[PDB]
A paper describes a structure:
At its core are three multidomain proteins, two hybrid histidine kinases (RcsC and RcsD) and a response regulator (RcsB). RcsB belongs to the FixJ/NarL family of response regulators with two domains connected by a long linker. The N-terminal REC (receiver) domain of RcsB is composed of a five-stranded central β-sheet surrounded by five α-helices and contains the conserved aspartyl residue (D56) that serves as the phosphoryl acceptor. The C-terminal DNA-binding domain (helix-turn-helix [HTH]) of RcsB has a four-helix bundle fold with a classical helix-turn-helix DNA recognition motif.
Here, we present crystal structures of unphosphorylated RcsB in complex with the consensus DNA-binding sequence of 22-mer (DNA22) and 18-mer (DNA18) of the flhDC operon from Escherichia coli determined at 3.15- and 3.37-Å resolution, respectively. The asymmetric unit of the RcsB crystal in complex with DNA22 contained one RcsB dimer bound to one double helix DNA, whereas the RcsB crystal in complex with DNA18 contained an RcsB tetramer (two RcsB dimers) bound to two parallel double helical DNAs. In both crystal forms, the RcsB dimers displayed similar structures, and the DNA had a classical B form with an average base pair rise and twist of 3.2 Å and 34°, respectively; the DNA was slightly bent along the surfaces of the RcsB HTH domains. In the structure, the arrangement of the domains of the dimers of RcsB was similar to that of the RcsB dimer found in complex with DNA22. Superposition of dimers in the two structures shows that the average RMSD value was 1.15 Å. Interestingly, within the RcsB tetramer of the RcsB-DNA18 complex, dimers formed asymmetric interfaces between their REC domains. We cannot exclude the existence of a higher-MM RcsB-DNA complex, as indicated by the slowest-migrating band. This putative complex could correspond to an RcsB tetramer bound to two DNAs as seen in our RcsB-DNA18 cocrystal structure. The RcsB-DNA interactions were largely identical at all sites in the structure of RcsB in complex with either DNA22 or DNA18. The structural similarity between RcsB dimers bound to DNA observed in two different crystal forms suggests that this dimer is likely biologically relevant.
Numbering used by the authors:
A (entry chain B): 2 to 125, 131 to 139, 150 to 207
B (entry chain A): 2 to 141, 149 to 209
DNA sequence: TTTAGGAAAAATCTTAGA
DNA sequence: TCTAAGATTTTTCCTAAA
């Protein structure tokens, strides 16, 4: 009858806000908060949970974060619903996230009531749907890691991939966003 | 004995978390939440308040955000304490914030009890910068004229080689003068550098 | 403090197979 | 679209003069 949820974000203030937002609902059961992927994966089999609420930017090294994490959780925990909630407002990155066949996407902006609305929709969003009506997944991941401060070689090391590949993906992404240098790049990703 | 606070953050979920975290304290009175600076300044004189808990990034075009906002609030409302809670861990940005005389700074990470500690520190008329802030400021100081010129041209959008040709010195000289400046500002790579210089224009 | 030189690294520019 | 191995450009690293 009940439903168990797991929240995952590196901001403990966000964890507290989400947990207090879910205590408004009595059929929701918070079975654990997590701040990194390494502990999350190690505690997933121990908790028979139903829904996972997570962010893309997460400090992990063994299982990573972002798309690479989702593809993992979709492959090793198929009986798990995933609702990602993100803080950034990049239409390309967001798009690449929506194209992962997940059970909901929640922006942090304009979402005081629609997160319980999506949670109740899993029993069967609004602002993100209104904004719903372009970069590839790999380009979006490279730009997300680059925005957080990771260098090209650092991103290549974090993904077990070649530096030349990450350089080509980033540079092509800049050519597709009409951006000529790194300053305007971070200026765009921040906007 | 009481104390009025105003919360300002563009994340409504973070706003909700801060509101519920301040509900834990009964001598704190949340007199208003705001998600942009334009609505914050227009309602600042209407509410007599004591403390303003704010973030750096704010979607306000008329009054700005970050440093530009603080400089305004310190100049127009001097009888107001400012607690800046932020998400980023840039030592140079945080340092530039502390050099504006704020009543406390709190990282959003690892502060479930730190913000009430700072609020209680404002009772004795003291500031409170927790251990995380001190560790962030440990990596940081006066800058030289050459370093300021190189950081200028690199700030506009000039490459290292471009600056080397404009100043008619070598590439390695400009590289050294830039990397030393980043070593003195506590910045570790180029992304945090451009974040800093974009925050302090 | 400012200025570089050789060595090394980091990042890009081609060109190209899946 | 994703991936990457050359040549090539760009930047840094150690080191060291004044």
């Amino acid at each position: 009858n009940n439903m168990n949820v797991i929240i995952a974000d590196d901001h403990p203030i966000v964890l507290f806000g989400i947990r207090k937002s879910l205590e408004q609902i009595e059929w929701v059961n918070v079975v654990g908060e997590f701040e990194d992927s390494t502990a999350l994966i190690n505690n997933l089999p121990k908790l028979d949970a139903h829904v996972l609420i997570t962010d893309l930017s997460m400090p992990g090294d063994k299982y990573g974060d972002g798309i690479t994490l989702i593809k993992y959780i979709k492959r090793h925990f198929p009986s798990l619903s995933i609702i990602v909630l993100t803080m950034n407002n990049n239409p390309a990155i967001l798009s690449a996230v929506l194209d992962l066949d997940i059970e909901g996407i929640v922006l942090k902006q304009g979402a005081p009531t629609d997160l319980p609305k999506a949670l109740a929709a899993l029993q069967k969003e609004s602002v993100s749907r209104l904004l719903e009506k372009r970069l590839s997944p790999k380009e979006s991941e490279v730009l997300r890691l680059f925005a957080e401060g990771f260098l090209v070689t650092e991103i290549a090391k974090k993904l077990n991939r070649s530096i030349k590949t990450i350089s080509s993906q980033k540079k092509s992404a800049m050519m597709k966003l009409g951006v000529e240098n790194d300053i305007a790049l971070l200026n765009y990703l921040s906007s």
